[model samples]
Target: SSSFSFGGFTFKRTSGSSIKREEEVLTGNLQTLKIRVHEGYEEFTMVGKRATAILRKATRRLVQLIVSGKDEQSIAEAIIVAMVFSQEDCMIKAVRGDLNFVANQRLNPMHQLLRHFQKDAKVLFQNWGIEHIDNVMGMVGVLPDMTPSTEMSMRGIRVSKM
Candidate 1:
């Protein structure tokens, strides 16, 4: 009989290593992603994961493009920096949105953050790569099913007084 110890836990790898690995990846990624809200809390809403995934893919592609030397590294870096900043702005807005719901407050913070995000996004698109921004922004607007209550049903529609 052979025995092995991992991280102070003694287990036979042949018994359940594959299951443990899957659980580890899923839990690790969940922590890395920092997903809030319960699994079924949102009836209808867009939480930005899809957009984030698209941006992640685009960043990888942009890195590859820069490595290929099709575009100058300086230019690529500038574009990447701008896009990164814009994405950060968007993420802040998403966090603030969650905070708004949790605190039952006005949408002022979310609105302000979104305004900055939109402005930065526009600049990034115009200066760096229109197609890249187009694809990224297209993913950005997907509404999550985060409706707080069905009584009023005002999910995902940005509200503004005329």
Candidate 2:
């Protein structure tokens, strides 16, 4: 027998316990991301998981790129820092501005994090010997699905006026 845990953490939410925050990613209103609206209570949505899924894949591909080789420590660190993130200026708007109103920026924090990573890695991606790391990503990678069903038919709510 082996002992190991692999399940991702589950959020144990209580009714009316979590703060009612205006979601930062979507603008105007998220009339298309909710699951249900009962008695005008609860805006249970799954966007968190869905957004994280794309991030999870990018990170996974980065790991696979590492697993294939390890010689240039400089490049290694570059990839490491990328996996952690390289920071961006979107945090301000991601928290305060509506993505639908002002301008377009990567919405999710993780997406912003990974967006920075993509820059440095593309250079290293060209350095892989005998082949390109992009190929590895192509072999070991798959992006998350963003089908309409994931965000269709949201709860009964709408934001009026700007």
Candidate 3:
């Protein structure tokens, strides 16, 4: 009974060691495409893979026309048809305000549609290997000026000398 008080503490080990393998320690974020019709904006939704196939077929057809010696009208007609056909599977939002302005005017919608597509998904065109699409506008003899704004002389462009 002469033991000096040497008792410190007894700790119990946690037997429930949860080595969680599937525990998602990090939280974050295919995405589905949706179409919306609004005043300032509209949307067209197409999956990248589907669009790739569409462009592949459509471009081949276009090139076929060229190889067949199709005239300007024939080629233009085919291109228009292809553009319209592409809309079958796509989501088209016809906003009454902004889009109507263009449609109400006498602008060719094929060009408009192509321009819009390029504006929205230019990366698709770049990645999908549709290099011939540049001539879509050039076909109309409206070679979109490539001159940089800094280099473009306003006087030279707007003013013509006699």
lDDT of each candidate versus the true structure: 0.24, 0.23, 0.23
| Top-lDDT candidate index | 1
How do these models rank on lDDT, best leading?
1, 2, 3
Q: Model 2, residue 18: displacement in angstroms?
A: 20
Candidate 1 residue-wise lDDT, 3-71, digit = tens: 433212232212111111111111111222222211111111111211111112121122111111122
Task: Tell me model 3's lDDT, rounded to 2 decimals.
Answer: 0.23
Best by TM-score: 3
Stretches of candidate 2 above 4 Å error? 1-66, 69-82, 85-105, 121-162
Worst 10 residues of 2 by lDDT: 153-162
What's the true lDDT of residue 63 in model 1?
18
Question: What digit string (tens of lDDT, one per residue) describes model 3 on residues 22-140?
Answer: 21111010112222211211112112211111122221111111101124232232233333323322312311112211535743433444444434432222222222222232121
How well does candidate 3 match the true structure in TM-score terms?
Answer: 0.20
